[PDB]
Design an enzyme around this catalytic site. Structure first.
Site: not given
Ligand SMILES: C[C@@H](CC[C@@H](O[C@@H]1O[C@@H](CO)[C@H](O)[C@H](O)[C@H]1O[C@@H]1O[C@H](CO)[C@@H](O)[C@H](O)[C@H]1O)C(C)(C)O)[C@@H]1CC[C@@]2(C)[C@@H]3CC=C4[C@H](CC[C@H](O[C@@H]5O[C@H](CO)[C@@H](O)[C@H](O)[C@H]5O)C4(C)C)[C@]3(C)[C@@H](O)C[C@]12C
Ligand SMILES: C[C@@H](CC[C@@H](O[C@@H]1O[C@@H](CO)[C@H](O)[C@H](O)[C@H]1O[C@@H]1O[C@H](CO)[C@@H](O)[C@H](O)[C@H]1O)C(C)(C)O)[C@@H]1CC[C@@]2(C)[C@@H]3CC=C4[C@H](CC[C@H](O[C@@H]5O[C@H](CO)[C@@H](O)[C@H](O)[C@H]5O)C4(C)C)[C@]3(C)[C@@H](O)C[C@]12C
Ligand SMILES: C[C@@H](CC[C@@H](O[C@@H]1O[C@@H](CO)[C@H](O)[C@H](O)[C@H]1O[C@@H]1O[C@H](CO)[C@@H](O)[C@H](O)[C@H]1O)C(C)(C)O)[C@@H]1CC[C@@]2(C)[C@@H]3CC=C4[C@H](CC[C@H](O[C@@H]5O[C@H](CO)[C@@H](O)[C@H](O)[C@H]5O)C4(C)C)[C@]3(C)[C@@H](O)C[C@]12C
Ligand SMILES: C[C@@H](CC[C@@H](O[C@@H]1O[C@@H](CO)[C@H](O)[C@H](O)[C@H]1O[C@@H]1O[C@H](CO)[C@@H](O)[C@H](O)[C@H]1O)C(C)(C)O)[C@@H]1CC[C@@]2(C)[C@@H]3CC=C4[C@H](CC[C@H](O[C@@H]5O[C@H](CO)[C@@H](O)[C@H](O)[C@H]5O)C4(C)C)[C@]3(C)[C@@H](O)C[C@]12C
Ligand SMILES: C[C@H](CO)OC[C@@H](C)OC[C@@H](C)OC[C@@H](C)OC[C@@H](C)OC[C@H](C)OC[C@@H](C)O
Ligand SMILES: C[C@H](CO)OC[C@@H](C)OC[C@@H](C)OC[C@@H](C)OC[C@@H](C)OC[C@H](C)OC[C@@H](C)O
Ligand SMILES: C[C@H](CO)OC[C@@H](C)OC[C@@H](C)OC[C@@H](C)OC[C@@H](C)OC[C@H](C)OC[C@@H](C)O
Ligand SMILES: C[C@H](CO)OC[C@@H](C)OC[C@@H](C)OC[C@@H](C)OC[C@@H](C)OC[C@H](C)OC[C@@H](C)O
Ligand SMILES: O=c1ccn([C@@H]2O[C@H](COP(=O)(O)OP(=O)(O)O)[C@@H](O)[C@H]2O)c(=O)[nH]1
Ligand SMILES: O=c1ccn([C@@H]2O[C@H](COP(=O)(O)OP(=O)(O)O)[C@@H](O)[C@H]2O)c(=O)[nH]1
Lengths: 429, 427
Positions: B14, B113
């Site tokens: 990235h 991003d």
């Molecule tokens: C935007 C979304 C991307 C999703 C897409 O993926 C991407 O797609 C590719 C394109 O193809 C890209 O290029 C990337 O490579 C690829 O990304 C990687 O994907 C692999 C496995 O696929 C992981 O291994 C790796 O880590 C990750 O980077 C997808 C899935 C659509 O495909 C990101 C991924 C992680 C994530 C879900 C975090 C982390 C955890 C979450 C939070 C938000 C709120 C939640 O958090 C929880 O909130 C609760 C209260 O409600 C609490 O109870 C609890 O405590 C707390 O955890 C949750 C768990 C959903 C949170 C902060 C979200 O804002 C934003 C999220 C950042």
């Protein structure tokens, strides 16, 4: 915004090299006035992407005009050789209009070619610093200046031997031509710019700098790459050939090979059985049945061809070239081995440098100075058709890799020298 | 001078794509604040020539720190996969420092991003227009968004089928909602590292599905000018032309011992020359390196990928199909032998195969890599070169991509110009 006016000599190869330099300066935030005759400005305008037009502006220089010498002949491009004296006389008469242009635009810097001693004199009279830019390589200049300082010594750093044909081609008139050329270099403020690069000519650059007592700054490789001009039908024909099987044949923008020369070239292409695309021109010819016996192996393009696009095509394996410097620089950048058939001015020296570098071969003239169909055939066979000169093809690939690796840093030294010169002259103003 | 702050996600791929985009804006007279964690800024600085440093300035984003999670781990590069939840949580908590940075620097534009829904929200609160930039291609995004609108219809304009290995509820929805929000919240357009010859119909379809303009800014490909290269180059110089595969699984994946075993045996059976980057968190079958001899080289940790792919001796790229690696291989004309691992990679390998510039080693029904697949494809593409068709399309793709110039950024620059002129009125 720092402004630079650029004054190439009235030849297509000169306008081409200056325009590539203009783009490099535009990318460094200079504003460019690009000054030539209208016929030359029209010819080079398709080479300027629209993105540059805000910062690279064309400025028409007016030469004296008559119905016997009208503005469409104010160029060397396709000019009858016997109008070259008129063209040079009229260019020198443009010095007054050129003075008026410099007074109107008041550029911070003038970049001028080596065929106009009056240009740095006009600039100096207006307190406009001026730098000479050469569109040849360095080898030819060092070879011409060496005998002035060392008349009884072989040129060092090369085994090149100039054929007797060019050794003889009033010594007082020849001296005055050389004094005007050297004045253009000598008058240059602090540095001269030249379209070359150190991997090819570093030793000659250093020697020239010692001989002239001025710093020589390389700004090359300067090579235009386009983004129909008849290419659609040429590409479709090249697409029917095997890889690296075809030679492009061209003698540049300001030379017309004689009937006898074209006979030797044609019979050489025929004996080699190569595929060929040959640009044939007539001022602003081939053996009877030559094209008919060539069949689908041969193509003649009248007037002008998309040279760069042809050299870059996968079917092109060789370049039968007069060895003008832009054509040599393009062929090296595109990795196409040169088969040199030099004609005059700097070309025999360029062919010798190509040969010494190992990226091409030279078709030798016979003792009487004639091109040899046997040489042309032999070298096309070895370099293109049978590819027994794998050494040349490898050196050509390696040189192109070197040249493709260069970027904008090739202009860092020029920009720094311009910066220093303008800061010094601002004080003295 | 118009200023832009750029906020990549914390992955090397990235930061790489964002830095190439930063360079293109710098050449268009924008001033760039390039914002990431210090470990990421350190890692990407070698790719920024000194001529850019006056107009591309690095800005440190601070994540929360602890002895159990120190700043050198604030990146996905080489990160233990089980620290990814912590890294994402820490990145979310950086939204406060990010607000302070936007307040201090007051950029005219934010480019962000698709892993940070809070970023366009912070920009909006400071009246800073924000545009999303995606470092994937478009195919994967359109494939994810299509079933939301058309649950009972097959994806159009492709025959690609996602292997069941990658197929296998509320948590999954929440991830997709955050990702799409990043795209949907973008002002007027989204930017993506792709190009129309490869993904035109998918860009058009994505634009209809998102109801937002998709603007391609690709190919974005870093080309260099040591880091081990002088010795690798001398080794490659002794090989035959197009005889060697580079093998790499990118910056944030560690293949399992089982996967390494299949790849290794596939390389051995092919009898190809290979350079293989093997990494360990911030392995090979016994005797494998011995039996390979001077045919094989293992590079530990990191290798000059671009220089290797450009070498005359390199005939193929065994790749996890991360998108920068795919874009580089297409630019350099090296056929890809796809061994995708996760996230967008199986989709990228499918596009490579569809375009005909590479091939995909297929997994077993249970999802295992097959040493026979790896060997067969390396044999056909690189060693025996019986897949002339793949090598030709790779060459033709390289020529297309080499024909592109600065005009690939015109649309982006014009949209930025319009967006700022509009928002200047409204503020
Ligand atoms: C935007 C979304 C991307 C999703 C897409 O993926 C991407 O797609 C590719 C394109 O193809 C890209 O290029 C990337 O490579 C690829 O990304 C990687 O994907 C692999 C496995 O696929 C992981 O291994 C790796 O880590 C990750 O980077 C997808 C899935 C659509 O495909 C990101 C991924 C992680 C994530 C879900 C975090 C982390 C955890 C979450 C939070 C938000 C709120 C939640 O958090 C929880 O909130 C609760 C209260 O409600 C609490 O109870 C609890 O405590 C707390 O955890 C949750 C768990 C959903 C949170 C902060 C979200 O804002 C934003 C999220 C950042
Ligand atoms: C004929 C003369 C200029 C012709 C033009 O005339 C100009 O016309 C007026 C109106 O048009 C203008 O207003 C100018 O005023 C007026 O031009 C002035 O002309 C005088 C000499 O009349 C110079 O003095 C003065 O500077 C210059 O301005 C022309 C065409 C327009 O008519 C030429 C210019 C380049 C030059 C200086 C060369 C190249 C470089 C030099 C050498 C000789 C020796 C030096 O070289 C050194 O010699 C050492 C010994 O070997 C080496 O150790 C060392 O390595 C090497 O560096 C030097 C660098 C000066 C050398 C070979 C000289 O022979 C002859 C020179 C050929
Ligand atoms: C700077 C010098 C270049 C000299 C070098 O060449 C170049 O070197 C290559 C590098 O390798 C370059 O890249 C170029 O391709 C190549 O250039 C071409 O070279 C070929 C054959 O060599 C010509 O065919 C072709 O035309 C020409 O462009 C050289 C020779 C050192 O190598 C140029 C050449 C023409 C010339 C001599 C003119 C025209 C004629 C002269 C005038 C000034 C004064 C005289 O003219 C006056 O006017 C009337 C002329 O009769 C008379 O009334 C009066 O007696 C007289 O005072 C004079 C005859 C000397 C004048 C206007 C000079 O200022 C400037 C001169 C412009
Ligand atoms: C869940 C929601 C956002 C989750 C985030 O929440 C944000 O959190 C707050 C603080 O954090 C912020 O302050 C934001 O306010 C708040 O975000 C607001 O969330 C509401 C919905 O709650 C939106 O309304 C509003 O815009 C948006 O701002 C978060 C952070 C929790 O992650 C996501 C964002 C992208 C989005 C809008 C997609 C993608 C695009 C859309 C589709 C479905 C329907 C539309 O698509 C059209 O459908 C037609 C029929 O098929 C087709 O004709 C056509 O082709 C197609 O265009 C549309 C374009 C709107 C679709 C699939 C929706 O299902 C669900 C959506 C997935
Ligand atoms: C119009 C032009 C410039 O305006 O005229 C300039 C002209 C003077 O030529 C200058 C230059 C080109 O050559 C210089 C030359 C005088 O050097 C001699 C040196 C080699 O010593 C040898 C010498 C015979 O013997 C050495 C002795 C000491 O033992
Ligand atoms: C053929 C190709 C053309 O493209 O090669 C060109 C090459 C030959 O370059 C020639 C040029 C570099 O030098 C010209 C020189 C021959 O002119 C002599 C004059 C300058 O003497 C000055 C002055 C009186 O000399 C002082 C001396 C008497 O001491
Ligand atoms: O239609 C197909 C499907 C995509 O629709 C989803 C819609 C019924 O509601 C989802 C909502 C949460 O956001 C969509 C939007 C803001 O309304
Ligand atoms: C199955 C495809 C191709 O076989 O592969 C999946 C892969 C391509 O996904 C990658 C990602 C880029 O796209 C996922 C995202 C677009 O939507 C995910 C969805 C489950 O999240 C809930 C979503 C917002 O909810 C919207 C609505 C239902 O409320
Ligand atoms: O049919 C042609 C002949 C020439 N050229 C271009 O014209 C230039 C010729 O310059 P060169 O220095 O080779 O020789 P000159 O014309 O000055 O003798 C080069 O850019 C060639 O690519 C072209 O585009 N089509
Ligand atoms: O040993 C290595 C491994 C990777 N890369 C570079 O790291 C980037 C990897 O990004 P990619 O999108 O391919 O996959 P990711 O690391 O995000 O999974 C590419 O620019 C590669 O050239 C490198 O230079 N040397």
């Amino acid at each position: 915004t720092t402004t630079i006016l650029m004054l190439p000599w009235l030849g297509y190869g000169h306008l081409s090299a200056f325009l590539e330099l203009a783009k490099s300066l535009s990318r460094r935030n200079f504003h460019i006035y690009f000054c030539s005759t209208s016929v030359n400005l029209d010819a080079i305008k398709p080479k300027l992407p629209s993105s540059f037009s805000d910062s690279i502006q064309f400025v028409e220089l007016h030469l004296p005009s008559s119905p016997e010498f009208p503005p469409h002949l104010h160029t060397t491009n396709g000019l009858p050789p016997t109008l070259m004296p008129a063209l040079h006389q009229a260019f020198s008469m443009a010095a007054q209009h050129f003075e008026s242009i410099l007074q109107t635009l008041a550029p911070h810097l003038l970049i001028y070619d080596s065929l106009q001693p009056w240009a740095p004199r006009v600039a100096s009279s207006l307190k406009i610093p001026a730098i000479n830019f050469n569109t040849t390589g360095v080898f030819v200049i060092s070879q011409g200046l060496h005998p002035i300082h060392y008349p009884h010594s072989k040129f060092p750093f090369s085994e090149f031997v100039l054929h007797n044909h060019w050794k003889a081609m009033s010594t007082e008139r020849t001296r005055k031509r050389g004094e005007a050329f050297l004045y253009c270099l000598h008058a240059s403020c602090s540095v001269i710019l030249i379209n070359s690069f150190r991997e090819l000519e570093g030793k000659y650059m250093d020697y020239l700098s010692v001989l002239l007592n001025k710093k020589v700054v390389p700004v090359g490789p300067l090579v235009y790459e386009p983004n129909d001009e008849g290419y659609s039908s040429i590409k479709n024909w090249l697409d029917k050939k095997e890889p690296s099987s075809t030679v492009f044949v061209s003698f540049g923008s300001e030379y017309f090979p004689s009937k006898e020369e074209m006979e030797e070239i044609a019979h050489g292409l025929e004996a080699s059985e190569v595929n060929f695309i040959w640009v044939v021109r007539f001022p602003q010819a081939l053996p009877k049945g030559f094209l008919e016996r060539a069949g689908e192996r041969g193509m003649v393009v009248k007037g002008w061809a998309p040279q760069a696009k042809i050299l870059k095509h996968w079917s092109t394996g060789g370049f039968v070239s007069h060895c003008g410097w832009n054509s040599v620089m393009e062929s090296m950048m595109f990795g196409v081995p040169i088969i040199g058939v030099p004609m005059h001015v700097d070309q025999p020296f360029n062919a010798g440098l190509v040969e010494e570098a190992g990226v091409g071969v030279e078709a030798k003239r016979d003792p009487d100075g004639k091109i040899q169909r046997d040489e042309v055939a032999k070298l096309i066979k070895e370099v293109v058709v049978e590819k027994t000169r794998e050494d040349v093809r490898k050196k050509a690939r390696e040189m192109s890799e070197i040249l493709r690796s260069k970027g904008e840093e090739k202009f860092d030294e020029m920009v720094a020298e311009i910066s220093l010169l303008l800061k010094i002259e601002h004080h003295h103003h």
